[PDB]
Structures are given as structure tokens and as C-alpha cells.
């Protein structure tokens, strides 16, 4: 099962496989599985006050599979760096689930003594430790 | 009575919100006057002030000494020892301490108001529960949307050691009375809990009028499925 | 997935056990809560102990979970085990319901006791064992035999008249030592796995019949868990006993069909897949050699059975030493290029990575060489030693200095291809293998041949470069034993980067370079010699 | 023997009117053209490039006038040079001359076994011929006369004869120019 | 030290659950005069007894007097007057105490555990909040099914005055962490709050699973 | 015929693969002789290539000159002022050109083989359609796996401006034919499109039988009421 | 300038859409009087009148001859050789006219739009690929539904020769960009390719949304 | 009038035994204690704290001893001040004196209409009184004599009267301390 994409921030796992048959070589099987985890306890944006819950989740197969990381290709005698997709414009995508391996903080006003302080909280505490 | 000396750790508010947190050593049980001398292990700009004496229980002089600028060493873990020497003594009193080890991270929780409080439709009670941390020092705050609620509009209790199911752990609870019309309008209420062990020294849990549910329905489209994934 | 621990742990009642589970040292993992649950019939982990200060009532006072971030592991020390602990626990991290766990089937069994009529004997597979059995003094010269109670009926395996069973040919001996001894010993060499069971003694067919039941059990090796990264390296310190210090050592690899697939023998054998990346160091006085396998991959994880045999293949009667390799696949090792194409007469510049913690260590560049069991001698070291044959045409610069160092090798020829290794003096050692393929073509940087100057005469030598390199910085870096250093200061146009030497002295003679670099990363280079004549 | 050409509207189209024409589609034709016969030659007014299998070539003519009236035919291109033709159709224009007068000698409720004759004529118009047109017919009327007292005999009428009838003038010099509609009569048969 | 006289109401625990409820009148700061007279003007019912001196603030001979059998008069609503004297001045020390009115019953709410705790399959926290009672006193206790839990298996906070504007009310909170196996078995867990304003004197509220969910998902696939 | 001067932009293939930004200035219609002179404003490469007096149809004489260059000045927006002073003109003429502005990046589309072409199992067509890029020039290269195919195995069309949907844009196609066995086996074919407007000046799109239209999809939706991280 | 003779053929558009199949056998370059004489080996009796006497680029006089009264009824494959004359030296100029065989029928495929352009829900780019026809002559027309789109509604590249083994073949492509709403509604687009080798002189391919029937998407929901 | 109290185990119990005693649930009673009777005083022996509406409170006593035997009464608590009580049962100790001898004048197969009397006596014990217990009874036996030849008449026996009969000594000074079970008699009535 060759994994095609594991989009963490939208949390879609797309895998593919080929099932052949030793007869009539036109009924070949190409199977693609898309597993989607849909949160029911996450705000629309990643912020505290926002659209108390998100009820509409849209999953476009053309944005799950995007790869906005350059690769190296050797054409004739030289290696050249090349992108691999068009729709990865600089990021601003709004995806649903949290990234287990990435920080997600927030900033909140508070009062201390004779001053106001804009404290930084931790919406995902495990992944935010300065090491 | 018998003189007593103890080192009091800085208040958690100044630790998690204040740049500088002082460390104090308090003394009691004086005999006739206060001619005490206070010394500490470090001497990097320790411009400590002796201060004036006070009155203890049933009458007795008592003076305490404060060392400011004990934030960076506190993070590092330096040992702080306060030594007190009064004229009516032969061996000065010592009290040593250091930043506590074996810390744990609170498991903050928000609870929606009970259904039996929505029926009366006058005021609803929101509960915050910060549970399961080793050092008893915890901070609780509430917010309406993104704006902080006044410190007098919610009740926060004291940090108590919950029964030991492992290491010794501490729990705190707080409640807030909020308008039923405001609750139903669509405002979101947050509880921010602060601690030493927490990653960024703070965390928060937010709740709204839909959280805890019901018959909420959601839609997913999955536009193109046979769409040349690459 | 990435969590690795003992796939099966054995122990006995009331005996402490220790389960080590490895995880990536990512900052998320080290601070994520580590649990140790026990899946049941309800299809849900019931956390029994956690790193967040929770110990179950049942595991209270008889267990503790301690997590070491530096190693990247956590241990679950469980005391006072009982038969009811036999089950499939799960290591892991974070929330139980997710899939960041590693199933661990811990099984325990009750020990013996109160049985004084039966003996026991446990020895490592393929070793030598002996059992001593007495016979009554009344039997002076009487038949002595060993009976094997196989299932329904017993059979004779050895007698006093020289009869030897076909199943014990040449590896079983009956001994009657002198000094007035009336006791017979049965010694078996090169123990197998087909001899476990109960044996009996017998002294003739008379009424005495001084029998004594005994038991024979053979213990397999315990896999020593190794948790390495993708494209990293593994080391096997095979240190078998001295008695097999003169036997042919082999390094098998188990499979599904329980069939060996030898990776490296001591008889100059080596699987094609592991070509050019596996060493076989010579054994020391006691037999302690190191087998290094670099260039780890997804399919290079399995059970390795390093042992000894006469022919070098796994067979019954061979002492062995098991292992178990787990390739992380969540590797933090940069995926540097594995193949470098060089142009004959041109040059290369291979960026060899290391760990940033050992930036103060010293580095090594090793031409891999086969033609033997395996070897890997140094060519250049960071301290300032350069092989005799590679004078003037090899350098090892610590310029990137943030987890990588460059090795510059110019004047490539047809004999300069092949695998190469990079080494350091640190503990966290990745032996990244890079292959140099030689391709025929014009070098980008024109050398001009090696020049001679008269004493005390200014010498001007230019080297031409493409203007694709015009963006890159251009340098000369006169070569020295410790390391070449860019000459102090030179191209009028897109080509012809020059060097001028005001005077020629015996110290100026030697090798010089001309090359390009992209700020801190080096590239193609060419080399020349300057001689002095009068 | 030839593809049929139908008109989705009545062949008696008034001035500044519209009409839709549908030809019997043949799949083997990749181009279909509408040709107007004038001075014994063809003239293309509508072209359709397609392989028709479900629908049929529908052409629209708007602002009906004398120039656009006449004989229409669909020409199909088969193969590289083969041509397949169809039946012809006629389009006329109404509203160039005065309305004649039409009447009947019966009560317009004649029994199915009765005989009714229709007289169409004009007094202030020199109309050479007259044509009796029944409302709703998709084909040109077959009832015409040559004398001034245009007589139309129906003989043994039946239920199919029921309908609205009108009369239109006809000049021998203007084959496809018709006059204004005359008084309408409902010749209901029951 | 400084002389000080005070009177403390009977505890709620012994009044509601115990057999005999004391009534402590405490005098401190004397540091002498062991022959201190403790008498009450309501010299009826039971006979007042004395109490041995103890150390208060290291320099006060704290003396306490206790009057068993005070449950019935306390419920009736009698007014108690404690009297004492010292050898310093010529005036005695008198204090008064009576049961206050304007009592409002608590509004007991047993909240469910948060959903972020059932995933870990560890102890799940049930919280019980009692709100809106006038007298500072209150009992909180727990039951798992039909049996009480010893007071060391759960945590109860003190009763605190709830910041309000209309009237003075006090609220208390408690949490009991029950094994996730117990919570998922289907067992019922209840919190009893005892009070004097309640006509029944004890109100209990229960929660369990399947109390009080259903999500409908629409798929399109173009 | 008529003396006319023109300038040509540097060939893209020599600008993307490498850096050789060699220009071209062509003068056509020499009156009687080849006594022409050339001059560029940045007279750094004084040894400008003076093309031989080549002939053309209808008795036409042309002198095309090539200035060797590098991508640096060109991508930095340099101004070129090639001139000519043929005797038949009383006043020298000048031509000017430079890097084009307002460039849109191509939207490369690698399209799998058509549905009915796979049935024949003889050869399959892979189409690489660039689209929307404003400058006329673009490079299309093809790779089978990681080894680039020679330019003689695929057909690539020109860049014909597409109908104006507001602004002027171009588009090119490039078919590459593959043995059907290679496709049905599972090999991966990549199309590399190189255009000036792109960030890296290069992009690629890779397709294999797994990254095409699948005959069956099994989609499972999982709800996470507890927390959205999905380990 | 230098005189030369060239014989063309009617454009495929005229052959497949009209009766204007007029061959041409013209001369480029002329600096003499009108001493022109044209002869065609066919003697069908049609009109071979001289066309418009005009000039060409670079001050050259060009005389063109057409065949207005003949629509090229040479399906039998006539040679149709034309010879010109001039007052120049004694060497008349004749043209070469022959019909190339080995005609190959075009293979036309209509490619559904790329998914990325479907997601943006603005437009979709339907591509038509015509590959494998021997004569380098083909014309591509588009239809939306049943109405042939105007020539400004699409784009078409030239006809180029494709790499092959031995046999020679050409190819061409075209793109029609249509608003995403039109595609999603279900409106059926079509590509017509006209080539000589086809018996019917036009091949049609139709594409519309929901064209993939054999797909077996499966949707399952768990808790 | 008063809520009942019952014992789920047989009142007869040897040394080191256990018994479960059940009260009656009262809806408003917020406490249910199982009390003791000793010198007309109350000493807590059990306490169930719950508003009982679904099941009756039960109290289990183990390690039965001489001090534990006696009178048991169940006391509730209504409201803040109201007290209420329940009935009173008795539990006794057995097995501290010699086992008396029991005999039957009949054959132990007495018909349902016959009369059978049981004689319990001992020769080496000064037993003041004797009690005749029957197996299966959940409360104290109602048969007790005063004379050394303790006579217990059954009169018109029936099916319900059938069972196992035993005799136990009884001292006036120690009501809740009995002797070992006597020779069981299987009085079967058929
Ligand atoms: C470069 O000049 C030197 C002058 O000594 C020549 O010497 C040999 O260089 C090669 C390098 O490939 C060494 O392996 C030999 O050992 C050198 N010779 C001696 C005697 O040390 C060298 O031939 C010149 N390079 C050329 C001609 O390509
Ligand atoms: C761009 O055009 C220039 C025109 O001079 C080319 O430069 C010549 O390249 C050839 C290649 O061998 C050399 O022999 C000549 O000496 C070069 N001319 C000069 C003046 O140096 C250049 O090669 C062209 N670029 C590409 C990529 O073809
Ligand atoms: C520490 O002591 C200094 C000196 O009195 C004071 O200014 C400062 O506010 C103190 N900081 C604390 C108590 O955090
Ligand atoms: C008085 O207080 C003591 C200790 O708090 C307690 O044990 C006792 O039950 C109370 N009541 C009486 C009457 O002693």
C-alpha cells in the first residue's frame, strides 16, 4: 500500500494500491482509500472566540495532495530545483485539525498590578516546550 | 514564644506575569527588640532592606527580609538559604530551600452549566477545574470572549491536595455566574489556568452554548474523488 | 508506529521485569504523556500506569514508569509479577485511543519446587552440557545405559557397549573416570533444539536399577533491541566465547520461512544488497569483533543471528547471538544525496552530515574497499593528516559547521569511483555512505596543466570557469597538509579566474586549487602543480 | 424517398413574424444547410455542423418578409463530396394587400352528411386568385380557385373538417405574397 | 496577651449525623486565673461542664466550656448567653449567640465529567456544586451507587461566599475521581449536600451514563 | 527588399539550463553590399560576433549578430540598444528590447492517458498542458522515473496565444507516448515545465497509475469528539 | 526577383465545408510583359481563367490561376499537371502534381478537465488531441451542446510530426475554456476533427460531467 | 404502626458467625442507623446514609460474639430534628453450654392429624429453661418451657409444621447466650 499523502493539518490520509489479475488484462483494479478525521470540538479558525463550532468541512482532493516543497531533478548534466504544484501560494490555508508536532498558541489580555499584559497561552500544551 | 523562621516562595501571580519575583524569609518570636542581621547565599546585587519590625501573636517583634531579583536563579535552580542572627543568640538560625522538582502539568477542564439552570433562564454557572499538578501553586482567570472578566465576578477556591493515586497532586475549582441572555446570544467564555509546569506557563479552555452536546448536524462534501492526486 | 519495545517479554512469578520502549526524541514525544495500558476484551486500553503521576490501584507499590528523554525511551519496571499478568500490554504516547503504541506480549510462568525426584539442566543453544549419574556399588561391571522416554515408549540413546543412537551421532559421550569412581557422566556437545525432554538412567537389568530422572532444556538467545534511524547505521559487537574463537563467524538475517539469508560471513561472502556498506572488523583476543552496517533502509530491519559454524551457515549445534533492529523512519538525519556523478578530471564536493552536538570532534573520509571480508581505511582526517596517495587532491573542510562538513576530491579518474564513508569521533555516529560514479565529460573548470617557474620569477596562472558559476564566489585555496586556505586578495570577465605569485620560492612549489563556493557550500574544483627550476 | 422538411409554425407567417423549420436528420451527414431557391439557384441561409442522432436540424427565421419567402430545402453533405437533398417547403407572407370577403351558404353547423360551399371574393381588389386556409395547418392549403367568385366545395364533410377557415388573396405575379386575413368562420361539424 | 471571649455554634456534622452536638464558648488571653467561672443564664436542660486550659498563642491559657445536649434547644431557636470573668477589671465578659434566619436552600448541581478525561481511561472526575445557601455551614458527601465513600477517597473544598449583588450566599464544590471502568460500567454516583435551610436537611443529586449526543453527517461525493 | 532591424530575446533553453543569455540582432535587406556595423550600449564584450553576410530568398542579404551573455544582466533588467549603419541609410537606426514584465506563471497540467487508449495496450499518450503564462517562451522536458528522456521521443507544440479571457495568455501542449506495459506496471512519468515567471524558474508534475483516475475509492469519515489532533 | 513556380492545393476547410475547391498553379517573380500561357493536362472543359493579376512582396509580379468552375472532382486521383510559359529562354516551367497515398485516419481523444481547475470553480479547460494522421492537413472545430462555437472560442496549435518508427504521422491539440458552472450543470461539449482520411470527413467526440461511470466510490462513517 | 425490621439469616448462630439485618426504607429519612439496646442506652452499630426509595437498607455483622448479641432496633432521622425508630429484634449466642438431649415420643412420622410432643432435657446441666427451635425460621422460636423435662406439644401438626427441630438451653441471667445444638429431629409430616 503506497501512501500518496498524509495531510496532517487537514488530517486526510490518501493511500493507493494496485490489484492485478492473470486474465483479461483490462479489468485491472486501482484502489484508493481516503481516511478523513472530522473534529466536532474545534472552532472554525484556530482561536478561542470563533463560530462556536465548525459545521461545514470541505475536502478538495486537489488541495490535500499538494506538495509545496521543491525537489531536485537531473536533466542532462546538471541538477535543477523544481516545484511540484501550482496552488500553494504563500501560508494562509484554513485547515481543521491541530498538528500534533507543531505549536498552536494564542494571546490573551490580562491585568497585573498597575499594568496590562498580553499573555501567551498554549492551545496544545504538549508540543510547546523550549528545548 | 519560641522563635521561628521560614522562607516563603514568591506568589505565582508575580512569577507567571511579573518579570521579577522577590523571595522572602520571615522571622518571629523576638524577645525585646529587633537587631537582627539577615544574610543569603548569593550576593549578586542583593540590596536587601531590613525593614521595620511588626507584632506577632500575643505580642512579639517580627521582621522579614526580602531579596529581589530572584527570577533567573529561580529558573536555574540555585539554592536560597536565609540566615538570621539576633543579638540574643549564639548560633544564627538557618533556613534553606530551592525550586521544587518533580512537577506535573494541570489537566484543565471546563464544564457547561447544568440543564436545570437553563430552565430558569436567569443566570448560569460555568465551572473551571484545574487538576493534577504537584506544586500547589495555581492561577485561575476567566474571560468573556476575548475580554477578561472582572476579578470579582467569579469565585475561585484554594488549591487542595487530592487523594494520592500516584504522586501527591493538587486540584482547584472555580465558578462564574454569567447572564442567561448573554449565554444564549452566542458569547464564548474561557478559563485560563497558569502554572509553573505548564509549557508556556499558561493554558486555556473555552466553552460556548453548543459545547457539551443537541442533535447537531455537520456536512462534508468531498468535492472530487477521482481527481489525479499529485 | 515509531514506538519500539520488546515484542515479547518473559519472566517468572514474583520476579521483577523491565520493559524498555523507544520513541523518537522529538520534543513533542519527550513531553507527551507516556502510558502503559493493557487492552482487554472491551477493545480499549485501561491505562495501568502513566508518566502523569497516575498508578493504578492494582499497580500501586509494585510498579513505576520512568521516562528518559536523552535516550529517547521509557522503562516500565513491574515488581511482584503473577500469572494473571500474562497478557498483551501496550506501550505508547499521548491519548490511548490513537495509534502511537507498540503491543508487548508479556508472559510469565510458575517455577518448580517440591520436586526432588527430577533434575533440571538449562544451557545456551549449541554449547556443551554434562549430566552425572551414579549407579549402585553392588554393580561392579554391569551394563549402564540412558533411556529416552519419547511419548508412549522409551528408547535407548546410549549404552556401555558402544551403541550410539543415530540421532546422537558423534556428539554424545559416556565417561567413566578413574580414581575409583563408580559414577558415569553423559556429555553432549553442540546442543540442538530437538533434545528437550526427560531422560532416565539405568544400570543393567538387575534388581538394583539405580535410575534417576533428569530434564534437558535449551535456552534461545535474547534479542538485544537496537533502535536506529532510517539512513543511519547499526553496530553489532559480536563477542562469542573463546571456544569458538577459531570458527567461521556468520551474520544471518531471519525471515518469514525461518531461513537464513547470510549478510556477511567470515569466508569472504556478502549479500549483493549489502554491497559496499557493511564492515567486518577483525576479532580480538577473546573474539570481540564489530560488524558495522550503514545506509539503513526500510527493509534493513529484522532479526540478526550472529554466530559461528565450520562452514559459516546457520546449522544445528552453532552458538549464536540474536538481535532486533528497528528503523525509525521518522529520521532526523538529513536526506543528503546518496549518489554523486563526477566528471573524469573534474571534481566533487560531498556534504557529509553529522550530529550538531559533536561539532568539536574530528572527522574522517574513508575509501571503502572490498576484496576481503570488508574494510574502510581513512584518507583524510580533520586534525591535519592526509593519505600519501591522495596528496594535493583531497580535503575535508568544516565550513558548513552546522551538522555537515565538505569533502573535496578533484582529479577524479576511472579508479576513483566507488563507495565512500564519513566518520567522526563522537558517540552519535552516522556512517553515511556516498557512492561516486565517474562519467566521461569535459570538466566545467578548466585546469591548465601543471606549470614550472624559474627561481624569483612572477607566475600568473588562470583557470577558466563557466559563467553559470559567475554567481558563485571563486577561490584558489592553496593546498597544505593541514588544509587548503583561500589565498589573500580576480576575474576580469565571466571567465578566467586568475592567481598571481609575485615571487617563486621553494615553499611556493606544491599543489594549488581553483574552485567555486555558494557562500558557505563548495562546488567543482580543479588542481595544478607549481614546480621551481633554475 | 427523400427526407421531409416540416415547419414548426404555420406556413402562413405574417409580416415581421417568425418560423422554425426542422429537417429529417440523417446521422451520416456532418453538415446541413438551408437553401432558398430563387432564380433557379441555391442560397445558404443557415448552417449546422454536427452529427445529429437524437434531435433534428432546427433553423429559425425572424422578421418574415417577401425576400425571405419562397422555396426552402435542406441540403446534407455526406462524405467528401456526396450530396443528399430532401423535400421542398414553401413559406409565404401575409399582410401586403386588403382582406377579401369569405362567406358560406350554410349555417356553419352542417351535419356530417350535408354539403357546404364557401364563396371567397373581393369587390375593390383585382385579386386574380384566392386561397382558403384552415387555421392550425402546418402545410400550405390545397384549396384554391382561379375565378373571381372563388368557390370551395367540401362535399361529404366529416369531423376532421371542423376548424377555423380564412381566405387570402393571390396574385399570379406574386406567388408567395399573400394579403391580410379575411373574416374568420368556424365551420364546426357535429 | 489580650483577653477575648467568643462563642461558636455547634458543628453541622455532629448536629445532622452525630449523636450529641457540643457548644463551645472560648476565652483566651487570660494566661492565669485557672478558677475562671463559666455559667449561662439559660440554666435549664443539661448541666454545663468545664474544660481544661490549653496553650493559645504560646501565652494564653485558653479555656473552653462545652454544653452537651444543645441540639434540641438549637433547633427550637433559643438564644444563648455565655458569661465569664477575669481578675483584671471589675466587669465580666458576656457574649450572645442565636440561630440566624433568612436561610435559603442550596441549589445542588451534579455536573458530568469532561469529555477530555474519558479518552485516557484513567480516573474520571465528577464535580458537585452547591450554590445559594445563606449560612456559611454545609455538608458535602458522596455515594457510589448506594454506599458512602470514606472521606479520604474524595475532595471537598470549603464553603465560600459567592460574589453577588442581591444577597449574601455561599457556594461549595467537591470532586470525586472514579475509575473509568466504574464510570463506564453504568454505576450511579451521587452527591449529598446537607444544610439547615433545607426542610429535609439533605438534598442528594445523582448522575451516571446515558443521562441527557446524536450527530447527522451528510456526504456529497459530487 | 527593405532594410529592417530587429532584436530577439535570449533563447530560453540556453537561459534556464545554464546561464548563457546570448542575444540576437538581425538586419535584413542589405542594399548592395555587406558594409554593416554593430554596437551595443553595454560594450563590455567588445568581441561581438559579427555574423557573416548570409543570403536569403528574393535576393535578400541579412547580417545577424549574436552577443554572448549570461543570465545575470538579463534577469536584472538590462537595456540593449543594437544599432546599424548600413551605407544606404543617411541616419543610423536603433533597436531596443529587454526582459518582459507582467508575467503570469504557467498552470502546468499533466493529464493521464485517455480511457480508451489503455484498452489497445500498445501505446499511451501523456499530455502536459501549460496554460495562462504571458511570455511566449516555455521549456517542456519529460522524465521516465528519474532519467530524462531524449528530446526525440516526445512531441511538443508551439506557444499559441489563447483567446482573450480578459488578458493575453498562452498555452502549449506536449504529448509523450509510452509503452502500455510501462504504464500498467506502475512507472512514474514526470513533465518538467520551465518558465521565466515561476519562482524557481522550474516546475514539474509527476503522474503514475496511482496518481490518476482510480477505478474504485473507499472513503471513510471518522468523527473526533474528544480532540482534533489525529495522531 | 528570381522567377519560380508553385502549385498549391485547396485548403481542407473549403473541401469539407464548401464547393470552392480551386487549385492554384502560380508563379512568383516577374519582370516582363504578360506573355503567360497555362495548360492543364485534364480536358474536362471547365474554366481555368487567370486570377487577379497583382504583385507580391519585394516588388515582384505574381500571376495566379485558379479553377472556379471546377470543385476538384478528381476522386479517382488525377495527375493534374500544370505547365507555364514565358518569353524567357527555351525551357518551359512545369509543376509536379501527385496524390500521396498511405493516408491514416486520425485518432481523436477528448480529455476531461484537470481536477485542480475544477476545484477553483471558475473555468474548465477541455482538451482535444488529434494524433496519427499521415497528411499534415486537419481542422478542429468545437461545439457547446449543439451550437458550433465561433473560431475565437478556442485555440489550436499547428500540425506537427510526431516521433515514431518508420511511418510518418502528425498531431494537433486544442483547448476550450468554459465556465465551471456550464460544466457542472451537465452541458455536453464536443470536438469535431476534420481530415481527408475519414470516410465521413469528420470525427466527433463528446464529453460532459459525470462521464466516469465505472468509478465505485465508497463512503462509510464510523461513530 | 412502626416500620418493620427483619433478619436475612437464621437467628441461631454459633461463635464467629455473620448475619444480615434489614430495615424498611423511609422516603424522607436521610439517615438509617442500626442501634443497640444495653441498659436502656443506644450505641451505634451500623449506619447507612442515603435517601432510600428503591431498596431497603441492610446491615451485615460479622465476628459474632457475646457482646454483639442482644436487641437491635433501626433508627431513622427525618428532617433536621425529627427522630423515628423501628421494631426491635433479638439475636442470641449459641454454643457455650452442653448440648441438651431431645427426643420424640412418636416415631417422627406423625400423620397430619396426629399429636406429637418433643421432650428436651439434660442430666449434667442446671439449665433453667429450654427453647425449641425449628429450621427455616427467620425469627426467634415461640416454643420455650420452664421445667427440666421440657415438653413441647405440636398438637394438630400439618405440612408447614414439618422440619428440623432442635433444642437449646436458656439461662435467665443470660437471655442472649444459648448452648450447642441438640440432636436434630427430622419431623417429617406427610
Ligand atoms: C602535475 O605536476 C606534477 C609535478 O610533480 C606531476 O607529478 C605527479 O602528479 C601526480 C598527480 O596525479 C602524482 O600522483 C605523482 O606522484 C606526481 N609525480 C611525482 C614524481 O611525485 C604531475 O604529473 C602533473 N600532472 C599532470 C601532468 O597531469
Ligand atoms: C550563446 O552564444 C554565444 C555566441 O558567442 C556562444 O558563445 C560561443 O560558444 C562556442 C561554443 O563552443 C565557443 O566555441 C565560442 O568561443 C563562444 N563565443 C565566444 C565569443 O566566446 C554560446 O556558446 C551560446 N550559448 C549556448 C548555450 O549555446
Ligand atoms: C521586591 O522588592 C523591591 C524593593 O522593596 C520592590 O520595589 C519590588 O516591587 C519587589 N518585587 C516583588 C515583591 O515582586
Ligand atoms: C464534642 O466534641 C468532641 C470532639 O470534637 C466529640 O468527640 C464529641 O462527640 C462532641 N460531643 C460530645 C457530647 O462530647
Author numbering:
A (entry chain J): 5 to 94, 97 to 137
B (entry chain B): 242 to 454, 456 to 472
C (entry chain E): 2 to 490, 502 to 546
D (entry chain S), H (entry chain R): 6 to 195
E (entry chain A): 242 to 453, 456 to 465
F (entry chain C): 242 to 472
G (entry chain D): 242 to 464
What does the paper say about this structure?
Immunoglobulin (Ig) A functions as monomeric IgA in the serum and Secretory (S) IgA in mucosal secretions. SIgA is polymeric and is typically composed of two mIgA that assemble with one joining-chain (JC) to form dimeric (d) IgA, which is bound by the polymeric Ig-receptor (pIgR) ectodomain, called secretory component (SC). Here we report cryo-EM structures of M4-SIgA and CD89-SIgA complexes, which unexpectedly reveal different SIgA-binding stoichiometry for M4 and CD89.
The ectodomain of CD89 consists of two immunoglobulin-like domains (D1 and D2) arranged at an angle of approximately 90° to each other. The refined structure revealed a 2:1 CD89:SIgA binding stoichiometry verifying that two copies of CD89 can bind both mIgA and SIgA. The two copies of CD89 bound to SIgA are separated by 108 Å (distance between the two copies of D2 C-terminal residue T195) and relative to each other are oriented differently than the two CD89 bound to mIgA for which C-terminal residues are reportedly spaced by 124 Å. Alignment to the mIgA-CD89 structure revealed superimposable binding sites (RMSD = 1.165 at FcAB; RMSD = 1.121 at FcCD) on Cα2 and Cα32. Consistent with the mIgA-CD89 structure, the CD89 D1 BC loop, the D strand, the DE loop, and the FG loop (Ig-like domain nomenclature) contacted a total of 19 IgA residues, including three Cα2 residues and 16 Cα3 residues, burying a total of 1656 Å2. A comparison of the CD89 and M4 binding footprints on SIgA revealed five shared interface residues (E389, L441, F443, T444, Q445) located on the Cα3 domain. CD89 binds additional residues located toward and on Cα2, whereas M4 contacts only Cα3 and binds residues closer to the Tps and JC, including R346, T447, D449 from HC-A and S356, E357, A360 from HC-B. CD89 and M4’s distinct binding footprints and structures direct CD89 D2 C-terminal residues away from SIgA and direct the M4 fragment C-terminal residues (and likely the rest of the M4 coiled-coil), alongside FcAB in a line near parallel to Cα3.
